[PDB]
Coordinates of C-alpha atoms and ligand atoms in Angstrom, one line a residue:
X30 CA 0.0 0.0 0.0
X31 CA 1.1 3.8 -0.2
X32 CA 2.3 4.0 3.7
X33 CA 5.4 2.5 5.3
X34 CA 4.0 0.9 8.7
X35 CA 5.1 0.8 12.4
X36 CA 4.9 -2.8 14.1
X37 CA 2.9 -2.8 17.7
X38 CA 3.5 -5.1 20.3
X39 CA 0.4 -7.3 19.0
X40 CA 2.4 -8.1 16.1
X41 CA 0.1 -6.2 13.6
X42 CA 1.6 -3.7 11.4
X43 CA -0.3 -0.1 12.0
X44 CA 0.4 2.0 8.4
X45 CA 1.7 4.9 9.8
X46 CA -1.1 7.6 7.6
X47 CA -4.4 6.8 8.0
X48 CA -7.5 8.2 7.0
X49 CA -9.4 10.7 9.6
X50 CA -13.3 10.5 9.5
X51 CA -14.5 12.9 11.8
X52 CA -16.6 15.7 10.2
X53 CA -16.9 13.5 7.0
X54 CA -20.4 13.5 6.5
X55 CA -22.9 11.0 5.1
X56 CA -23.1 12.0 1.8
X57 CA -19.5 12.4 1.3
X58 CA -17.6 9.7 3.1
X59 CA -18.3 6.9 1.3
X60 CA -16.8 8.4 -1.6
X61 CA -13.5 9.5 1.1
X62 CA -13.1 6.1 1.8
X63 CA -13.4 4.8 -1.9
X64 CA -10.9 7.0 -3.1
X65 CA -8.6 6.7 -0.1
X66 CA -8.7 2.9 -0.5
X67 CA -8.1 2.5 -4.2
X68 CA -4.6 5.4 -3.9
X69 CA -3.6 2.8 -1.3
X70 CA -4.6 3.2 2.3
X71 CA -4.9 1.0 4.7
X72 CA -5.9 2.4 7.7
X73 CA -9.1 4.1 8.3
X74 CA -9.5 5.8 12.2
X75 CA -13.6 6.0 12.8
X76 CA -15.5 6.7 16.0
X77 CA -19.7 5.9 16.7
X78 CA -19.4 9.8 18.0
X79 CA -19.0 10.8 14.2
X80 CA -22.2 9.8 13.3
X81 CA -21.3 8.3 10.0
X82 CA -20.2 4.6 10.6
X83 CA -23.1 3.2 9.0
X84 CA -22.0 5.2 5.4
X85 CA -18.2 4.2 5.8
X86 CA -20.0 0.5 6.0
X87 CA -21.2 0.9 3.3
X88 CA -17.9 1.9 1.2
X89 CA -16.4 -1.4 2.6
X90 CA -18.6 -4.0 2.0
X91 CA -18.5 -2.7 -1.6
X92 CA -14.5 -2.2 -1.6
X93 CA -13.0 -4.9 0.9
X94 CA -13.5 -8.3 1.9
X95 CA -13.7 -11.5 -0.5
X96 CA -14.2 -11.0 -3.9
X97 CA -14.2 -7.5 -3.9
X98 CA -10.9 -4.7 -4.4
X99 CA -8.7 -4.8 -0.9
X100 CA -8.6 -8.2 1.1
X101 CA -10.3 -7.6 5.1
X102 CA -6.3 -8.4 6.0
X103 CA -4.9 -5.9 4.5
X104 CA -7.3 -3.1 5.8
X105 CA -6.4 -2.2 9.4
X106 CA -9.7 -0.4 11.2
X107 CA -9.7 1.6 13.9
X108 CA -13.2 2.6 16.2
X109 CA -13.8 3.9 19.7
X110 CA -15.6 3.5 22.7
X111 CA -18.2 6.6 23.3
X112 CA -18.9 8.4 26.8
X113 CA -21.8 7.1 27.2
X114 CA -21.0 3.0 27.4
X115 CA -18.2 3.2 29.8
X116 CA -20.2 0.7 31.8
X117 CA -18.9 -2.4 31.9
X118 CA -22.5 -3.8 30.5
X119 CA -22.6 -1.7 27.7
X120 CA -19.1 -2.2 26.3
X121 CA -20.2 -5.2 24.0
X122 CA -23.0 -4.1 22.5
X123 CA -21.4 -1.0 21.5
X124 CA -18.9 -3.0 20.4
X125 CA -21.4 -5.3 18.1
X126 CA -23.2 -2.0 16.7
X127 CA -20.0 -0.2 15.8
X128 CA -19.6 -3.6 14.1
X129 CA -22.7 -3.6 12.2
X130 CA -22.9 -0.3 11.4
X131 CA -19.3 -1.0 10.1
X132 CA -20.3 -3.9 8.3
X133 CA -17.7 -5.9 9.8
X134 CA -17.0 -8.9 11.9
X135 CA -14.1 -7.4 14.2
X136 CA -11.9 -4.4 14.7
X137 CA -8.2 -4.0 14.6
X138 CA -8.2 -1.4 17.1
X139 CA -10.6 -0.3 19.6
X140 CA -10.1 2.7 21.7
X141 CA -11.6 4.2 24.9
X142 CA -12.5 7.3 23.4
X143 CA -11.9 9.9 26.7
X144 CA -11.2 8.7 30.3
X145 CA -14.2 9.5 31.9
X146 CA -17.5 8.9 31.4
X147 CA -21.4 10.7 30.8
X148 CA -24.7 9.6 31.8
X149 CA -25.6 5.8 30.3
X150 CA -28.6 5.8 27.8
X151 CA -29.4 7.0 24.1
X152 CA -28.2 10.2 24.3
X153 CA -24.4 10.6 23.3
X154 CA -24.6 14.0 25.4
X155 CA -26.8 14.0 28.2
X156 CA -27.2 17.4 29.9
X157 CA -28.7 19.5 32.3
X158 CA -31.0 22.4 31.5
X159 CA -27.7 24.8 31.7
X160 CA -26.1 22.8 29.2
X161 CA -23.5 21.5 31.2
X162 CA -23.1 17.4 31.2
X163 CA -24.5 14.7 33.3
X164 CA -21.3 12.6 33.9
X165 CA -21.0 9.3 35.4
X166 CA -18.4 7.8 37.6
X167 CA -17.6 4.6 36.2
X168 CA -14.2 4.2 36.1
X169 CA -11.8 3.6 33.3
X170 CA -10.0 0.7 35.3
X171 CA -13.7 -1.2 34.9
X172 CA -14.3 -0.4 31.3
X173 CA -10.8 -1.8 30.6
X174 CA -11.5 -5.0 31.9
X175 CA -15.0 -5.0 30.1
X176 CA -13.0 -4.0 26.5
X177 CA -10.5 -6.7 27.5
X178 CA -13.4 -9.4 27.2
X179 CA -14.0 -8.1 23.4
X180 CA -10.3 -9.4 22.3
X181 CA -11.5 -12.8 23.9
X182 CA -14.3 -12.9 21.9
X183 CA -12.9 -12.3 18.9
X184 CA -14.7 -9.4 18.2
X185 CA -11.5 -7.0 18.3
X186 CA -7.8 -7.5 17.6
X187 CA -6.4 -4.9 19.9
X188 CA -6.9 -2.2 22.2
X189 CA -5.8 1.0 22.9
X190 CA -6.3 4.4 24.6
X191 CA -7.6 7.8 23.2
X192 CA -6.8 11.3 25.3
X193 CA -5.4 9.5 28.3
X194 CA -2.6 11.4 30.2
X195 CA 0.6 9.6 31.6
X196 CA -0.9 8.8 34.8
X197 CA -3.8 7.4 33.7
X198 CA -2.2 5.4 31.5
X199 CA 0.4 4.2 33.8
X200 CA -3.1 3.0 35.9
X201 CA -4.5 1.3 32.7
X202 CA -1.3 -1.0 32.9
X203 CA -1.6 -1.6 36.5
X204 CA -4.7 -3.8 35.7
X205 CA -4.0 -5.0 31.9
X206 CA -4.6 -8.6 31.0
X207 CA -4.5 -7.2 27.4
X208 CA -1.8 -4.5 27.2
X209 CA -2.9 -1.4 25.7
X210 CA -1.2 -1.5 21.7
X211 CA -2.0 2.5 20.9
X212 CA -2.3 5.7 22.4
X213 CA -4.4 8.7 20.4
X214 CA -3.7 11.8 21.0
X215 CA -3.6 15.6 19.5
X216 CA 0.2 16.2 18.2
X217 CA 1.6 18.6 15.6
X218 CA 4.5 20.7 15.9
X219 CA 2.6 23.2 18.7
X220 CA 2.1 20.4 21.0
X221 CA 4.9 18.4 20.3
X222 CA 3.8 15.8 23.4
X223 CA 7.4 15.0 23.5
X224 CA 7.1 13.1 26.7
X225 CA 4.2 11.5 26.6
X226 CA 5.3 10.1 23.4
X227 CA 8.6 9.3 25.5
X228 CA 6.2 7.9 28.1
X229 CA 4.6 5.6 25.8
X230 CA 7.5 4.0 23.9
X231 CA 9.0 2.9 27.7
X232 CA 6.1 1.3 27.6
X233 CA 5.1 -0.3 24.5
X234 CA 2.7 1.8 23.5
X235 CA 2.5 3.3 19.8
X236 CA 1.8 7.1 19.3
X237 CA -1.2 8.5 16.7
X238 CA -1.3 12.0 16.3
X239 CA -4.9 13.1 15.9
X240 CA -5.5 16.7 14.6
X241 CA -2.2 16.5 12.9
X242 CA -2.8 19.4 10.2
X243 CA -4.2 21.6 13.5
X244 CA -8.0 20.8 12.7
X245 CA -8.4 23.9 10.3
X246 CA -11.9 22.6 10.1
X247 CA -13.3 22.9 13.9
X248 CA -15.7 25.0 14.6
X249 CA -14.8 26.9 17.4
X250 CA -11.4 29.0 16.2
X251 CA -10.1 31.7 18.0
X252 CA -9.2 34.3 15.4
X253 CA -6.3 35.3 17.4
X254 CA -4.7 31.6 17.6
X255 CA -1.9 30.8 15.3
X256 CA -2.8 28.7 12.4
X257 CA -0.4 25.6 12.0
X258 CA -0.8 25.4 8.2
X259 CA 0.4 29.2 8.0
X260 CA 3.2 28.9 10.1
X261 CA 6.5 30.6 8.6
X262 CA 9.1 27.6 9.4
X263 CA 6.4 25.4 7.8
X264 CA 5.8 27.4 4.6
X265 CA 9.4 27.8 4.3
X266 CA 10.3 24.1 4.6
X267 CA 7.1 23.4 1.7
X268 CA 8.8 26.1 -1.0
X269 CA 12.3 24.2 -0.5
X270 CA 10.8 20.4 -0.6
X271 CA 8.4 21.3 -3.4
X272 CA 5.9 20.1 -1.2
X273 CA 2.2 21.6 0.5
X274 CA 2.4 22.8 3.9
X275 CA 0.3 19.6 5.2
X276 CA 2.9 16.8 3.7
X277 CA 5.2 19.2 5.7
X278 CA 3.2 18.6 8.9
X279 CA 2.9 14.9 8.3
X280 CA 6.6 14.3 7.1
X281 CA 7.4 16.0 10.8
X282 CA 5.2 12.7 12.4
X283 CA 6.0 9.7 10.5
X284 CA 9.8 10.8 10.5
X285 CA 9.3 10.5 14.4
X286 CA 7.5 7.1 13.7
X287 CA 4.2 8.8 14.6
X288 CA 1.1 7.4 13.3
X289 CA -0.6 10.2 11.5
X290 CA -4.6 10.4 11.0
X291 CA -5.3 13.4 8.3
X292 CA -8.8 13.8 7.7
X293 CA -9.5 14.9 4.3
X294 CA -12.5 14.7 1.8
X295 CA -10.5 16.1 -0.9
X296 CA -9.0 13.5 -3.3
X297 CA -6.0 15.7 -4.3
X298 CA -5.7 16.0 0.2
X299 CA -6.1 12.7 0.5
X300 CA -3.4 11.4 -2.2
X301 CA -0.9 14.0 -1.0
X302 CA -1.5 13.4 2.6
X303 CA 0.3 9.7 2.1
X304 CA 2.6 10.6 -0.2
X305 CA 5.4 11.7 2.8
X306 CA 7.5 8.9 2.3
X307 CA 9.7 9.8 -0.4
X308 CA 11.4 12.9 1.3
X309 CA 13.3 13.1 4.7
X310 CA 14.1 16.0 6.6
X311 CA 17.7 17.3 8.0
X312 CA 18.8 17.1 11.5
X313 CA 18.6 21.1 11.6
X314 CA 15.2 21.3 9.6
X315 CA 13.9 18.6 12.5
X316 CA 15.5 20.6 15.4
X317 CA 13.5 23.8 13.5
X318 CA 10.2 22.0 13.5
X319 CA 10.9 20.8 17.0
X320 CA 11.5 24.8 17.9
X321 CA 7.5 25.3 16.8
X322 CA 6.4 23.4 20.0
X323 CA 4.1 25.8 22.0
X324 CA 1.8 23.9 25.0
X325 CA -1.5 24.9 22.3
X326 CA -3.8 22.8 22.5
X327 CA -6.8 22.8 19.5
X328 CA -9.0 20.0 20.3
X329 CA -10.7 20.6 24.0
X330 CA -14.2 19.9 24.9
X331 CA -16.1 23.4 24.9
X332 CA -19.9 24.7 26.2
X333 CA -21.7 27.9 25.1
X334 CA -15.0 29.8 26.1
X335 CA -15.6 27.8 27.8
X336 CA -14.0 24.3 28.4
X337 CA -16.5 21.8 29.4
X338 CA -15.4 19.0 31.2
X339 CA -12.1 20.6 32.5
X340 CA -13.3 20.5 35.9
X341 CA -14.0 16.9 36.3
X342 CA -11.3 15.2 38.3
X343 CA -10.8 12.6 35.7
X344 CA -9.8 15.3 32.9
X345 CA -6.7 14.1 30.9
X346 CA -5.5 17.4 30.4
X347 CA -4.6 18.7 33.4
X348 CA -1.4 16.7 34.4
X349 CA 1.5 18.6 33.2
Ligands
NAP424 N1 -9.5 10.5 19.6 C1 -10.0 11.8 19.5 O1 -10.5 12.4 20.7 C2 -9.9 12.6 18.3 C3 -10.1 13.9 18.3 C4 -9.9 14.7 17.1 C5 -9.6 14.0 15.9 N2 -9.5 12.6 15.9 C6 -9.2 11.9 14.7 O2 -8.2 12.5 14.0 C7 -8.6 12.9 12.7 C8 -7.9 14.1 12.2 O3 -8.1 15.2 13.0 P1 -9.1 16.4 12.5 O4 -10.0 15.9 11.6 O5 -9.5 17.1 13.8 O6 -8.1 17.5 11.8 P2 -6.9 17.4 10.7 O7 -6.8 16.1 10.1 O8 -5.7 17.9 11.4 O9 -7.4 18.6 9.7 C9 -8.6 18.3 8.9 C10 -8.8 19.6 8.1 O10 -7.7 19.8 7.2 C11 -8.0 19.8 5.9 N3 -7.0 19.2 5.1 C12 -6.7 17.8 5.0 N4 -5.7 17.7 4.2 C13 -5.2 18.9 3.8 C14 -4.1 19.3 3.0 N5 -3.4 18.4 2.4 N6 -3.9 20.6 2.8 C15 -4.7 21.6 3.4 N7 -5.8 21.2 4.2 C16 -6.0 19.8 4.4 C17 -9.4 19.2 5.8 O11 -10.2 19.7 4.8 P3 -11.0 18.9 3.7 O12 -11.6 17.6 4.3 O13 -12.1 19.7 3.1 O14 -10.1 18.5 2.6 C18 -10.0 19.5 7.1 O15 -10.6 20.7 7.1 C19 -10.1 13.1 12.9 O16 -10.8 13.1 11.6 C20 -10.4 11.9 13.7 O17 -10.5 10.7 13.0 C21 -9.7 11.9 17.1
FID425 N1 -13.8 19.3 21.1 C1 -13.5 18.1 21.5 O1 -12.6 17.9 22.3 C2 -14.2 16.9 21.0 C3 -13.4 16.3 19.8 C4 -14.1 15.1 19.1 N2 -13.5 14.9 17.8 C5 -13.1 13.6 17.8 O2 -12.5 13.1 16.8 N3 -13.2 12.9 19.0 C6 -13.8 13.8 19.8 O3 -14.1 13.6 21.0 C7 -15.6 15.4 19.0 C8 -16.3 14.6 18.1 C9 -17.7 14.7 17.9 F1 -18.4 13.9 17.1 C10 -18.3 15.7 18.7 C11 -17.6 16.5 19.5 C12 -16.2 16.4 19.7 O4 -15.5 17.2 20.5

């Protein structure tokens, strides 16, 4: 396929791009997945939070599997574990829906979406009449040992961790059966998460850098935030490589053997965004993009300013 691939302790080869699906609507992303399939990628990251696993279903019970264009093997598919079904009852069958939504029989990689949880039931974000959320205390020690009972049953290949901070992590291990394989988190040049990354690799844990192009597309930008794609180190390292600011971005990563998950819908995005294997960067133009690193975070759970969940005592963010 088009991307080189990093080896987790399971044994299974993770291609180091993959394709991000969040904000890829129904009625787009079964074409993203089409296309991203047939330039040669292999790894698609999903979540039941986006709201569009039953279309991305659809693209690969068309496009993979026996008799059709990529073999199940080859494709390596990633969901996650929502808020909401944190309790250890309600692990499986959100399991088995992300699985029949996804039109498949098991997962390669299932994450624990955040750390804490909300309120069980139907509604993906139960709230009060002030907006703020009705959270539940079950505790990401018993949802682990519910998750680990998915791998026994065949139903997922591996586990991992999403937005999970050092200590919590190093807690996760304390009680694993089934080691964690991944852990997903936002990285880019401003928030380099040098030592987590550190952290993890002591530990066996592979790295994949969500929001790795800075999220241009979220909807809550503060105009006076730097924009990553802009940046002048960036735009100066594109002109030399003959490259686009976002293979600049992604080159940074998967130099660093960190997973990358671009979401595009864009098939010139798309093809560009794994083509960052050809091209290497200097010691000095590394020790440049390692300058950028700032502390900014983009991706951070917000209310009707201001940050959301911040003040729950199981919030990832926190910890230094
Ligand atoms: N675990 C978590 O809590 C979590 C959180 C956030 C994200 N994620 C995962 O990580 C994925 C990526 O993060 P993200 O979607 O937030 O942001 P991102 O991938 O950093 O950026 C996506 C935006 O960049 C644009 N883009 C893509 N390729 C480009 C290129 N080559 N040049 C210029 N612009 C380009 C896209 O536009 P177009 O689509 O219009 O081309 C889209 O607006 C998500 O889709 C999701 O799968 C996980
Ligand atoms: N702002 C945030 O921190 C998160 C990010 C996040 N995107 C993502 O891929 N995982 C997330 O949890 C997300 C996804 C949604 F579908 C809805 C909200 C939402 O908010």
């Amino acid at each position: 396929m088009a991307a080189s691939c990093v080896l987790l302790h399971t044994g299974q080869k993770m291609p180091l791009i993959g394709l991000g699906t969040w904000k890829s609507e129904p009625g787009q992303v079964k074409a993203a997945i089409k296309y991203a399939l047939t330039v040669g990628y292999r790894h698609i990251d999903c979540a039941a939070i986006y709201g569009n696993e039953l279309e991305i279903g659809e693209a690969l019970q068309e496009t993979v599997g026996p008799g059709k264009a990529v073999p199940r093997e080859e494709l390596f598919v990633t969901s996650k574990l929502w808020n909401t079904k944190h309790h250890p009852e309600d692990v499986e069958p959100a399991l088995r829906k992300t699985l029949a939504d996804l039109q498949l029989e098991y997962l390669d990689l299932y994450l624990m979406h955040w750390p804490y949880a909300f309120e069980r039931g139907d509604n993906p974000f139960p709230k009060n009449a002030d907006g703020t959320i009705r959270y539940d205390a079950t505790h990401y020690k018993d949802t682990w040992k519910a998750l680990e009972a998915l791998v026994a049953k065949g139903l997922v290949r591996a586990l991992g961790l999403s937005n999970f901070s050092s200590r919590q992590i190093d807690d996760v291990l304390s009680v694993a059966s089934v080691r964690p394989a991944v852990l997903q988190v936002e990285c880019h040049p401003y928030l380099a998460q040098n030592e987590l990354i550190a952290h993890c690799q002591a530990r066996g844990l592979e790295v994949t850098a969500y929001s790795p192009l800075g999220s241009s597309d979220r909807a809550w930008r503060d105009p006076n935030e730097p924009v990553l794609l802009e940046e002048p180190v960036v735009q100066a390292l594109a002109e030399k490589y003959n490259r686009s600011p976002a293979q600049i971005l992604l080159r940074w990563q998967v130099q660093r053997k960190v997973i990358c998950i671009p979401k595009s819908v864009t098939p010139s995005r798309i093809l560009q965004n794994i083509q960052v294997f050809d091209f290497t960067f200097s010691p000095e133009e590394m020790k440049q993009l390692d300058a950028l690193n700032k502390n900014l975070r983009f991706i951070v759970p917000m209310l009707t300013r201001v940050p959301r969940d911040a003040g729950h005592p199981l919030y990832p963010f926190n910890d230094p």
